[PDB]
Structure 1
Amino acid sequence: KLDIKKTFSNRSDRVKGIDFHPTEPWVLTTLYSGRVEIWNYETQVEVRSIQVTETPVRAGKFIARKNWIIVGSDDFRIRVFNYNTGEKVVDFEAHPDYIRSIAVHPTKPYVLSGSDDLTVKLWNWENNWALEQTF
């Protein structure tokens, strides 16, 4: 027996990515349309909405430690925004092909991006977001 309760539902374009904020009752969603949204699923109020690109955004993660969200899209770009202001922190081409997944190190300033270019790249934000390694 599991006590399942539907805390919140919302309709929108296809969402390819989703992530929970660690201390705020927010959830981040990256859409097939290029939109990325943030919702307070407890108050049911939309926090913010951003038109990142016209291409689909498959990956998205919070980086609370820095008040950011980092998203990866089909236009091969990784973009970072400050979720408190909606400000673009960094925007750069990470791969020559679609980005599928993004992982964030729990301790170190590292980010992993998986892509259709058959590789995984390690980025370090405490070093001007440099490509530290390609697997």
Structure 2
Amino acid sequence: MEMLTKFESRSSRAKGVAFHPTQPWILTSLHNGRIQLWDYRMGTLLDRFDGHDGPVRGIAFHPTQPLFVSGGDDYKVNVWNYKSRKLLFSLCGHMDYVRVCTFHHEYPWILSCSDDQTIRIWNWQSRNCIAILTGHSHYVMCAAFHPSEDLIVSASLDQTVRVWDISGLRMTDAIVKFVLEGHDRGVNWCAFHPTLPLILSAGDDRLVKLWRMTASKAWEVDTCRGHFNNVSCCLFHPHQELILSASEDKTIRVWDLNRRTAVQTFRRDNDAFWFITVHPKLNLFAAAHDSGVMVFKLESAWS
């Protein structure tokens, strides 16, 4: 395959990117603590947001509200209104770096996870922490809401990927369902497929693992092998039978979903990759690396 680059920012190290679901925008969260709002069709910086000290790793839009959330090495989870351009409030409680923060698509919840070994669920209407999910024994590097079930998946440097049942909180509140074992070093990332009962995880063992889950059990399907440094991030292609991963080996790698064979490697000469994401609807991807962010489409070779 080939990468058709649509937009590139040059900046200090970028840690997170989030696509707006309807506007042609991305937020970027930087190692210097600043958050940029870019229009990738015009190539214009629309706004900058400064509300953190130190790197900002978590960044996400609400799917329908004029809000985004950011999470920092200053332990803060900040909720912003991008229409009024205000920091509405800070959610305090984590006692170490926040690694990821996201909005739920239906409930008024924010999910965050932290080096303090916990996942927190907050209600952004009440501004209260409604659940602290404990059990991991090292940094929690990633957590994600399931798209249609009352589940969370999390990834930790304790070498496990945990699936948590939060049906109780929806209606004790949260119970661990699976403690997925298989990675031989810390796990940095985990993702759900948007429509299939699959999970992807990636870690310092250089492995991307594909897992399948039913209502009552789970199993490792297969492993994508080839990265030669820590894997920072992984995701499912939403509309193609493909897996994508990004790594400190300075590559983004595309893999076949059904065989886990390598399809294509894209390299940068000097930049480690820290994060990749995909637009919910469009064939549009973004990657954050040592020198900034790129927005790109993926096309078959010789198209």
Q: TM-score range by the shorter chain?
A: over 0.9
Aligned equivalent of 1:13: 12
The runs of at least 4 aligned residues of structure 1 exceeding 4 Å deviation read none
2:82 aligned with 1:83, yes or no?
Answer: yes
2:127 is matched with 129
Deviation of 1:125 after TM superposition, in Å, equals: 1.3
One-letter identity of the residue aligned with 1:22:
P
Say whether 1:42 aligns with 2:41: yes
Shift of 1:53: 2.3
- Whole-Å Cα distance in 1 between the matches of residues 104 and 93 of structure 2? 18
Q: Aligned partner of 2:93: which letter?
A: A
Q: TM-score, normalised by structure 2?
A: 0.42
Taking the aligned partners of 1:49 and 1:55, their CA distance within structure 2 comes to 15
CA contact (8 A) 2:53 2:72 kept: no
| C-alpha distance in 1 between matches for 2:119 and 2:49 | 26
Which letter maps to 1:35? R
Q: CA deviation at 1:64?
A: 4.3
SS in 2 for 1:65: coil
Following the alignment from structure 1 to structure 2, what is the Cα–Cα distance between the partners of residues 54 and 13? 15
Is the contact made by 2:52 and 2:76 (CA closer than 8 Å) also made in structure 1?
no
Give 1:70's aligned residue.
69
Given that 2:7 and 2:40 are in contact with CA atoms closer than 8 Å, whether structure 1 keeps it comes out as yes
Question: Where does structure 1 lack aligned partners over 5 or more consecutive residues?
Answer: none
Aligned to 1:110: 109
Please give the alpha-carbon distance, in whole angstroms, between the structure 1 residues aligned to 2:120 and 2:41: 35
The structure that has the greater radius of gyration is: 2
Equivalent position SS for 1:4: strand
Using the alignment, how far apart are the partners of 2:114 and 2:23 within structure 1?
30
The secondary structure found in structure 2 opposite 1:106 is coil
TM-score normalised by L of structure 1: 0.92
Distance, in Å, in 2 between the alignment partners of 1:53 and 1:113 is: 16
Deviations 1:52-90 (A, max 9, x none): 223111110011422011000011111111112211111
Number of paired residues? 133
In 1, Cα distance between equivalents of 2:93 and 2:21: 26
Q: 1:3 Cα deviation (Å)? A: 5.8
Q: Distance in 1 between matches of 2:91 and 2:105?
A: 22
Q: In 2, distance between residues paired with 1:51 and 1:103?
A: 19
1:60 aligns with 2:59: yes
What secondary structure, in the 3-state scheme, does the structure 2 residue paired with 1:7 have?
strand
Deviation of residue 47 (structure 1)?
1.0
What secondary structure is seen at the aligned counterpart in 1 of 2:100?
strand
- Superposition deviation, residue 5 in structure 1: 1.4
Cα-Cα RMSD: 1.3
Provide the C-alpha distance between the structure 2 equivalents of 1:14 and 1:107, rounded to a whole number of angstroms.
32
